[PDB]
Structure formats: C-alpha cells, structure tokens
Design a protein around this nucleic acid. Structure first.
Lengths: 130, 72, 122, 52
RNA sequence: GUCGAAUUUGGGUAUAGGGGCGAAAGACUAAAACCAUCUAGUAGCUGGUUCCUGCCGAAGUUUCCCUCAGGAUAGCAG
RNA sequence: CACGGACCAAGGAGUCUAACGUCUAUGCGAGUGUUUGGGUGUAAAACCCAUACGCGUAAUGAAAGUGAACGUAGGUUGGGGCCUCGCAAGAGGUGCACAAUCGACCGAUCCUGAGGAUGGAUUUGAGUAAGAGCAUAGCUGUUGGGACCCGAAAG
RNA sequence: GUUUGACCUCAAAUCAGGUAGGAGUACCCGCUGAACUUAAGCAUAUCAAUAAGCGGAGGAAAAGAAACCAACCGGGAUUGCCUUAGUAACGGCGAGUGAAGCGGCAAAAGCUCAAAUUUGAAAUCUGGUACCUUCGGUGCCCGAGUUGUAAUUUGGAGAGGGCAACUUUGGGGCCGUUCCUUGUCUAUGUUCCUUGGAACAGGACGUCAUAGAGGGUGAGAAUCCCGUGUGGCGAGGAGUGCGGUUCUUUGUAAAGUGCCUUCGAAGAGUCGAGUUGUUUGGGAAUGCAGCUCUAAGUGGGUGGUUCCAUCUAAAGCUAA
C-alpha cells in the first residue's frame, strides 16, 4: 500500500490493540444473581437451561428451581403539600361532608372541582391526620 | 369512514369558492350552461380537465353556483 | 438443447464468494451471547403470535406473525403499551378475522403471563 | 479466490466412513499397519475406567 | 488568378483554421500531436505449445441440407 | 523453396469457474440432499438439527379441465437361469432382464341420444401396464467467460 | 403637523458569536454518460442504466413503519441470506435480458410534525450580562416571536367533562460492579559422558506440564532467556447498564386503566390527463424527467372473477 508502507517504516509506532479474546467472553452485567451463577465454560443457551430460564420463545431452527427460587424470593418481597393540606382544612372546617355545598362554594373551591375529587383528597387528608 | 362529512371543511371550501371568484375557464363554463347547456359545457370541461369523472363533478359544482346565485 | 448464460456483462467485477460463512456464523453467535449478556434474565426475542399464511398454496400451514393486535392483547387482559415492556410484540396494522387463530394467540399470551416473573421498579 | 476450496460430502457417506474408522480401531493388525506400538498391551479395544 | 514571398527578429500578447448541401441562416448522416484509462478491444490468419514405454489404430469418401464462406450429416477406427 | 534457429542459464503456454450433458465410482433408495441457517465446538476444522425448499414419485391438453388394473397387471411369439424325467444325448414345466406383434386404463379427439349416457374406431405420449431416482466424487464433452500462450487495420 | 413617531423592506460595520470550502474515497447516496465488443452486413438491441467525468455523506450509507402484498382458513416497516428461479415477463420473440409475492432463516423497534383557541393571561426560545456545584444552572436585561414559539392532539384515533372512595410517580451525588486504556506478579536441568569452534546433537540420568504455541540464544533447546498456560494484585479514565448508601422530592403537579356523557380537521402546479424524451422483466404501457392542460372529499389510490378487498399519498426521524 501507500500509507501502510510509511506507517510500517516510521518511528511513530502502531496503535496496537489486542481485543480478540474479549470478543468471545463478555461478562454478564445486568443481574448479580445471574452474574454469580453463570458457567463461562458453557455457552449462552447452555447457561439458560442450567438456570432453567427460557432463552428463545420461538422454537429454534436446528437440534437442541436452583436459582429461579432466589429470583421469586426477591420479587414476592404519595403525600400532600402544605398549601393543599391547608386548603382541605378550610373546606372541612366550613362545610364538613356536604359535597354539593362544598363544590358550589366560590370562596374555597376556587377551582370548580367535582365531588369525587373532594372526597378522595379529604380522605387522604384524614388518613394522614386523625 | 371514507370521507367523513366534516361540517367545517364543507363550509371552508364553499367559503373560499365564493370569495376567490372563478377561474377564466369556469367563468366561460357558467356562461356556457345558461346559453348552450350542460352538453357542450361537459365537452369543454373534459378537454380542459383530465378525465370524464372530473367533468361530472365540475359542471355540477358550477350548476350549484348558478342554483344559489340566481334563486337563494 | 435450453441454457442461458448471463456472462455478457462485466460479471468478473461483481463476484461475491462467501468464504465468511463460517466466520459470520461465529459473529452472529457472539452477537447473541453479547445481547443475552446485556439483557440477562430475558429470553433474546419478543413473544411472537401464531398466524395463518396467505395464498391457496400455504393456507394449510401455521407460522409466526409479527405481533398480536390491540384486540388480542386486550382480550388477554392487558394494554399494548404495557405488553411491549413485558416483551410482547404488538401489531397495529394486522386484523383479527379468524376465531381459531385469535383463541390460540390469547391462550399463548395467557400461558406466557403465568410463566413470567416481572421485576419491580425498586 | 473463487476456486472451489470446500468439498460437499453426503452425510450418510460421511457417517459410513466415521463408523468404519471406529470399526478399524479394534482390529489390532490395522493398528500395527497404521503405526502405533501396540505389541505390549493386553487387548484391543483398550478400555480404561471412568476415573481417568 | 497565382497561403505570391516572408524577408527580419528579441520580448510580450491575441484571434482563427476540419465536411457534402444551401442565397444565407441552418440542419442531414457521414468518416492535426501526445498521455492515461475503458482494454486481456475484435482472429474467417502467422509463430509456438514442455516426460517415457506398451498396445490398438484410420480416413483422405457417397448421399443429404445448394453454395464462395458458414459448414452441418453415411463409411473407416474404437 | 520460404520462414525460425550465434551460444548458455533461468522463466515460459488447455488453467480456474459457471451452466448444462455422457460414462464410472460411492452413500442412501420411492425417496433423496446436514453445511440458508440454528445448536455445539478442543474453534474457519469436526459433530448434531427444527421448519421449509430443490429434483424425483403422473401425465395429458392451447387452456378450462381430467387423470392410468376387467383379467394371477394380459395374450401370442423368443428368452439367460432353475425345476422333473433322463447312466447321457434329449423332452417337458417354469419362465428374469430384454425384443416383436395383437389388447385393458389416463388425456384430448366423433357417432350413438342416457341432456352427453352403454358401447363402437383409430390418432396423439420420451404415458399406466406393479416404480428408479436423488446426492457426492472421478475421467470427460459442449457452451460462456481474458479462456492454450504472443501478435492486428482501433473507437 | 411644512413636525414628531410607529412599522415594512433593503443595506452596512476588521461589530458579538458562529459556520461552509480542501484531503481521503473500498464500500455508500446522487448527477452525468460513452465506446471497443456481441449479435449476418446492421438506424433498434447488446456491452450498460457499465467505464471515464462531476457533486455529497458515515461508520456504515441508503432504505424503513404501507396511498404494501395478496385473493388466503389471509399475511404485515425496511434490509440481508437460502428459496422462488433462469420461473413470470421483455426481446429482428435473434444475440440475449430477466424480477417479485409466498415459505425458511439472520436481525428486529418504534415513532414525530402540519391541519380543530393557552386565550383565566407566549405557558416558548436565542443572545448579552453577574454569580454558581460549568458538555450546564440561576438572576437581571436586549430581543425573536401572535404572518404563531410552548403544552395537548397524529387514526392503533383523539379531545373536553363526570363516575371509580380504581393504579402509579420525579432529580442529583458518592462508593461498588460494566467497559476502555494501562502496569505488574505467578513451573521445571543449564546434571554427567562422546562429537563438535560453539551444544541447542547423540547418549546417560532426571523434573514441570490448565504451560511440549512461537522467537532468541555460537547447529534440531517444554526444562537457559523472553515468552506460553492458569489465576492473582493494582493505576488512570468512560459511563448510567444495575448493586448499595445517601441528599433532594410538591403542586390543588404529571400521567394510566375501564365505563358514562359531548364533540371530532387528515400534506395541490399535487393526483390525474395528454404529450416528447429516457428507463424497466413490466406486453398490464415499469419508473422518472420536461412541456400543455389540471382535480375531488360518504374522498382518493392500488389490486381482484355485479361488485369486492386492501391501503391513506402529495410532510419528517429511527438501531440491528
């Protein structure tokens, strides 16, 4: 070649990268339970059937509870603002439970909200209080 | 739901139709309906436009220009 | 007696010989191994539907489809937007017309939903 | 480069040869004809325990 | 009529110049150098074509598709 | 005649491939072909394989269409072998492959009139008539590629 | 008011800040485009939608989420490989050219604008400028902008309300792991006799071997050296993939599910038609380009024996 001829002749030095052994054996990353139980001497599909998990949901072309219990173990195992709370304080102290009157009030229910919104928000207020 | 009616676009097309006036051939076409009739009107429209189905919709469109302008 | 030889053009410029058949099989298996190393607990492919092939010739055969439908996913008891997060391929342009295909897919979805273990966001 | 390098062989023909090859490992005279210093051994086919 | 003919050339610096037809404008359809590629351009031809022994071993021709070319197809040796 | 040949060394010309075909070898055989791929691998090797696909197992007709057993798959003529008798020669039975001739069925082709019926006669075919192919390898032939090696009046 | 002031358009400035060219070019996207040749001499044709020429990109490019294919018991973005298959179709029906759907497989992923008022509030953005925890954030100011920047909405519809005492929740650190670059450690004879200039040879005796690949060393050296094989210990970065720990979360804030209730637009010198030219396997007139003419919305396109099926053009992005 033209450029390669000079680069193999120059005293600059080649940017040699030996990244061939890293192409075959890539470490499993996304799950530490799988990361501890993965036999690197076995292949991908062999390490799936060893653990139990299905590797391909479509039936493959060609010819083909030890750990899943640990997964099952770790898988079987919204507050209100100061102003919103004080707003619901005002509504309860002036009305109580008359949601028709409570939502037809122009002074406290400035946002013309329904009855269902009011009873839900007040019960959130009542659960967090006495 | 091929060409869903759309009350607004029918209004808009007809709103622009009355404002913009008529193209010089359509201006001849509406004179040609009153004098010579739909026979020669469709003949000129077919030569002017692409196909016969074009000339159907166009002469009828112009007949509705006349039907609204004269009566109502 | 017939024979037709398409060697009238400058054919000798475009001759592709696939010496990399053995190299490219290794390359795809390394790709699968990498993808399964990044997508650790999950299979390697989305859950695909059962589908009847078109044409008088192949309408005997049952094959893999692209995705289910909004109809088959709803009848299974979940939403299309949520199905994709669980790895169920969804086809918006496909239509449901055959009852046997429909029910086979719904049961394929239902058995899938029994066998899975969805991880919490915490 | 577009010379033929690889040779297609029939699969049962390939398995014929591999079976015949196994068949000839326990002959003891073909083993001497092939090479293999096998005079001072008890019997062929030679079999050792699984602990190997 | 007769680049008559360049004599006289240093430096600088331009414009042109190939064909029938046609009044012209224009169009029909032909056919000055060097370098690199297309390019291993086309062969109805010239020249050449690389070890040994054994055994068998021709024809140099009819008829047919006419033919110059382009050759095609019964006999002799297998 | 003419053309080449002063002498020596080294180089120097039927090669590779695609397509189709004959013959032979091999594996399997009404089937056959793993190697597009997938799995696996001691890692371009080897070893496994799902689904399809290719060619073949059915042809005929322009297409629509229809679709190969009346018989022990048929009679007659020959026919390697084998069988019974023959002290042997010879006679008879059975007759494989294959060859000739008279028939049965498929296909399109007309009368019969039951609409197209039962039966009547040929023509077509690289037909059915109890399959023979698929794949790999070798010698090789034809055609296309720079195509046995060097050379041409060039656009 | 014979003045002053809004705009609009067009300029300039060594203004502030940016950006374009050239190289390389195998592949990739375009434009432009032959001939030798091959066909019986030969305007079609062929080589060939090739070479040369010109422009334009990246690690890939291009393509791409149907104005797709089909005719089924229907499939479902693209791209690629096997198959279709030298098939359909084209062609002095000559030399020759020559697909695609289906089936298998590789790989797979989806989305975003314009068009319907935020109108109880341009909610948007660039620059300048002062700080800060700086691929940015915050404050103030000049502007862009209503001839429309934001949020909502894209047909798979979608939106405004009401009903579930329906379900959910963001952002930044730090330290681990992932990756990249880089450093280092990790077995056994130089024991005897002969030949030799030299032992790395022959012979004798032994070792290590998850290391007897390779090279060097005064001739063929696992065991002399570097290495190899197997694991161990570090350093500097990239980063959000996840594992911990930790600091923040808020506002009548942002969603999703099912039902009820009220509404509800979809890309024009474009499709098309004619036409000359190019081009394709595309006879059905296959694509495209120029020129004439130029549409419609129970629209329109594309197929299939009275109709039926299937798409949504003339806007845009997107890995493998």
């Amino acid at each position: 070649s033209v450029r390669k001829r000079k680069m193999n002749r120059s005293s600059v030095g080649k940017a040699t990268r030996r990244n061939k052994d890293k192409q075959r054996k890539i470490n499993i990353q996304s799950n530490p339970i799988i990361a501890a139980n993965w036999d690197y001497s076995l292949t991908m599909a062999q390490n799936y059937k060893k653990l139990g998990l299905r590797a391909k949901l479509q039936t493959p072309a060609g010819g083909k509870e030890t750990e899943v219990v640990k997964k099952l173990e770790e898988l079987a195992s919204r507050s209100q603002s100061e102003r919103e709370e004080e707003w619901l304080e005002k509504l309860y102290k002036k009305h109580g439970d008359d949601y028709k009157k409570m939502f037809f009030d122009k002074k406290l229910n400035i946002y013309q909200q329904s009855e269902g919104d009011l009873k839900r928000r007040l019960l959130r207020w009542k659960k967090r209080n006495g | 739901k091929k060409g869903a009616a759309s009350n607004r676009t029918k209004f808009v097309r007809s709103l622009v139709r009355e404002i913009a006036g008529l193209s010089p051939y359509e201006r001849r076409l509406i004179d040609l309906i009153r004098n010579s009739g739909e026979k020669r009107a469709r003949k000129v429209a077919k030569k002017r436009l692409g196909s016969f189905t074009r000339a159907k919709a166009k002469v009828e469109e112009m007949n509705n220009i006349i039907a609204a302008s004269r009566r109502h | 007696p017939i024979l037709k030889n398409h060697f009238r053009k400058h054919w000798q410029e475009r001759v592709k010989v696939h010496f990399d058949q053995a190299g490219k099989k290794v390359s795809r298996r390394n790709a699968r191994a990498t993808r399964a190393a990044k997508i650790a607990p999950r299979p390697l492919d989305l859950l695909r539907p059962v589908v009847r092939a078109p044409t008088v010739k192949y309408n005997r055969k049952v094959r893999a489809g692209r995705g289910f439908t909004l109809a088959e996913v709803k009848a299974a008891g979940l939403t299309a937007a949520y199905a994709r997060t669980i790895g169920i391929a969804v086809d918006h342009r496909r239509q449901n017309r055959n009852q046997e295909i429909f029910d086979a897919n719904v049961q394929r979805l239902k058995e899938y939903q029994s066998k899975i273990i969805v991880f919490p966001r915490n | 480069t577009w010379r033929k390098w690889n040779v297609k062989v029939n699969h049962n023909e390939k398995r014929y040869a591999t079976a015949s090859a196994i068949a000839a490992t326990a002959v003891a005279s073909l083993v001497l004809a092939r090479g293999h210093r096998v005079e001072k051994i008890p019997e062929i086919p030679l079999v050792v325990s699984t602990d190997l």
